Structures are given as structure tokens and as C-alpha cells.
Amino acid sequence: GSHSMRYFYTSVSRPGRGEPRFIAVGYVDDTQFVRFDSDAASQRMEPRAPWIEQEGPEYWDQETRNVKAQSQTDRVDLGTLRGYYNQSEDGSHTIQIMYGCDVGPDGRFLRGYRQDAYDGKDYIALNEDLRSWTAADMAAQITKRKWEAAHAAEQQRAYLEGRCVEWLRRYLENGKETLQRTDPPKTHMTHHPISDHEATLRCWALGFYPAEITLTWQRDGEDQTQDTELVETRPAGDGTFQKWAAVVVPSGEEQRYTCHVQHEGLPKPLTLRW
């Protein structure tokens, strides 16, 4: 179906503790494929998925160059930004960049992204048109004017509409068995009585891919959102995800409740009953 490639950069200034720490991570959908850490011994972009391991040294050379160039720009920008907000050398600060593109089932460009954040708060973002910028504050307005004069949006659009989608095509072909997979969830149910008249009914969804799942509780057919607890979709650590949904039910009425699991990897939605 529709796919996405995304990159997440983090630059953290460490005063007195040397130079800023730069961490870069690359994703194709919910699969982390590349990494870079300024603290690691390698000082190279490293593979984190089997399908990217087939890339030659010319790929790793270019990726390392790009990522180090941004780490160096962030090193200077950290200084510039503390002059903007008039902050001391004393404090530790954070620069975060998110960028990428979404493709349709045809493998053609849909939408592109580029957004920056200083100290967790939105700084500057490239608009949907990929031609204009949105500055979140007065400091960001200076960056906006600089980026407007330098025609930064044209260069970003050229990547997001161009090279970004072309890499995604290459990645989707080279990792078809992994990226185009639809792992269905391993469902099971647990019952734990809290009181003599109340009980917790918990429904599990394990080892599924992609991360997109829908867990819903129903009482005799009617939807149930009252007394329902949900956990954030968590990684299993093997490239699959986990999620559970619980409901507090009156003792003896456990058979009335049904859990409905909705996932891409399922031919039809599952119905679980205690």
C-alpha cells in the first residue's frame, strides 16, 4: 500500500563534557534501517535492517558525509540559537530535525516533510506546498528570512519530491519480504478478579507488523469505552509490536464482553471472548 521514509536527528549540547552528541535514525515505515551516533567507535552510518546491509561502501561513505555535515551545522546552530534566546554557555540544549516523504501504492510522491525543534518546542517547519516556511517564534523568523534568501525550500523540495522517493522505491524493492510483509497479531485473553464482584478482562495482541492496530471492547454487541484501559503500542524488540486493552467487568458477566482486533495482516477482524 502506502509507504514512508523518515529521518530523525538529535543534537544535544553538553557544556564542559566536550562536543554535542548527534544521533541520527532512519526509518522505512515502522522499521528502523540506519543509525549514526557521534559517541560510537565506528564514526559511520550503520545498518540496522538486513536489506540495507547489501549497500556498498559508496552508500555508507555518502550517508556518513551527509550526517556528519548536519552534525557540524547543528554544532554551530546550537551556539547561534543560544544567542537568539540569549542563553548562557552553562545550559544543555537540544536541536531535533524530522524529514521524509510518503509514497502511494504506485510508488509516486504524495507528501514531503521537514520540521525543526529547539528544546522540544517547534522552531521552523516546511509547509505542505514545500515552497514556504512556518516560523514558530521571533528567533525562528530570522532563520526563515535566512532560508528564504538562500532558497532552502527549493533544495528541500528537490530532495523530498526527488531523491527521497527514489531511495524509498529502491528500499521497497530490496526489502520486499520484510517491508511489504503483514504479520498478524498473536491474540490471547486474561482474567484477573480485583474484588468479589469486579474483574479485569485483558486482551492481548503480540508480534504484529505494521504497528497500526485497533483494539476495541464490546458488551453484547454494543461498543464499550467506559472503564476501558489501553497501552501505547510498544516494540517487542524483534521488529514486531505489542498492545493490550483491558476492561473492568462485573463478576459473572465476563462472557458478555468481546474484544475486536483490527490489523492489516488479518483477513477479517478477530473476535475474542472469555
Partner: peptide, 10 residues
Amino acid sequence: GTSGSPIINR
């Protein structure tokens, strides 16, 4: 693959 150029200062 990552973005090479621009990489312009803030």
C-alpha cells in the same frame, strides 16, 4: 538515503 545539500545554518 539522507538529504545531502542544502544543510544551511539557522
